[PDB]
Amino acid sequence: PETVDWRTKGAVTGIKSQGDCGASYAFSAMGALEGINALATGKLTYLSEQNIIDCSVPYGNHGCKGGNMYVAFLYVVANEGVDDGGSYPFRGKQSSCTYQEQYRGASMSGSVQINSGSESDLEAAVANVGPVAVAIDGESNAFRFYYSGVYDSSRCSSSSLNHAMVITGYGIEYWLAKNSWGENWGELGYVKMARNKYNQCGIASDASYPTL
């Protein structure tokens, strides 16, 4: 298809704000999982980024100071589940791990990594599977203060990436990415990024999604 948006399938939750906590990895990872789960199960369940922040330090994440999607997925697989938000809510900072099995919202068996730099493989993932976790270069003041339109940056790097989000669709040529800086940033917390511009901002350098 020429354009998808996974809200069409009820596979995307509201926009979140990570506050002053540097945990996009978590928000980005949970976002893909929420989608995959909502598609399969038919019910959208909000999942807990706080769970990932508190409990994935031993898998090699840094709580509120940063981390990866991969390492968040390993935690989910090894811990055989992630709690949902309702019962494990965002506090804005690293707290004790209160992971409880009774509130396990979702589980998974692995992650598929999209071939680094390939946007046609990325589109194929997004169209045929679901929302895909990505990371980008959001260094620019233009990104930091993006408000509307298609982001099409000349200064963007395709290798050293500093911010993670969920691709929830694409259209016309852009990607539709969901950020976690709350609803007052971008287009309702969304950004439309440049599609098929030879991997601008490294959108397809480190894309993945979970299996379940």
Residue numbers in the entry: 3 to 174, 179 to 218
Pull verbatim passages from the article behind this deposition.
The tertiary structure of silicatein-α, occurring in a crystalline form in vivo, was measured in situ by serial crystallography and realized at a protein crystallography beamline at a synchrotron. In this work, a total of 3,608 individual diffraction snapshots were collected in cryogenic conditions from 90 different needle-like spicules extracted from the sponge T. aurantium. In each spicule, a rectangular beam of 30 µm × 10 µm was rastered along the axial filament to avoid measuring a previously damaged area. These data were sufficient to generate a complete dataset with a resolution of 2.4 Å. Using the known sequence of the most abundant isoform of silicatein, silicatein-α, a well-defined electron density was obtained allowing the reconstruction of a continuous protein model from Pro3 to the C-terminal residue Leu218 (except of loop Ser175 to Gln178). Surprisingly, these data reveal that the postulated active site of the protein—the catalytic triad of Ser26, His165, and Asn185—is in an inactive mode. The distance between the hydroxyl group of Ser26 and the imidazole ring of His165 is 3.6 Å, too long to allow catalytic conformation. It can be hypothesized that a rotation of the Ser26 side chain into another favorable conformation (a distance of 2.9 Å to the imidazole ring of His165) leads to activation of the enzymatic activity of silicatein, which is also supported by an additional hydrogen bond network including Gln20 and Ser186. However, in its crystalline form, in the axial filament inside the spicule, the enzymatic activity of the protein is switched off. To form the axial filament, the silicatein molecules are packed into a single slender crystal with six proteins in a single hexagonal unit cell belonging to the symmetry group P3121 with a = 5.96 nm and c = 11.63 nm. Remarkably, the modeled images obtained parallel to the c-axis and the a-axis fully agree with the experimental TEM measurements.
Silicatein is the first discovered enzymatically active multifunctional protein that catalyzes the polymerization of biogenic silica and is key to its subsequent condensation and shaping. Using a close homology to the cathepsin protein family—sequence identity between silicatein-α in T. aurantium and metazoan cathepsin L is 52%—silicatein’s mechanism of catalysis was modeled. It is suggested that, analogous to the hydrolysis of peptide bonds in the cysteine proteases by cathepsin, a catalytic triad composed of Ser, His, and Asn (a serine protease) is key to the polycondensation of silicic acid by silicatein-α. The filaments in demosponges were demonstrated to be perfect slender protein crystals, and their branching on well-defined crystallographic planes of that crystal was shown to be responsible for the high spatial regularity and symmetry of the spicules.
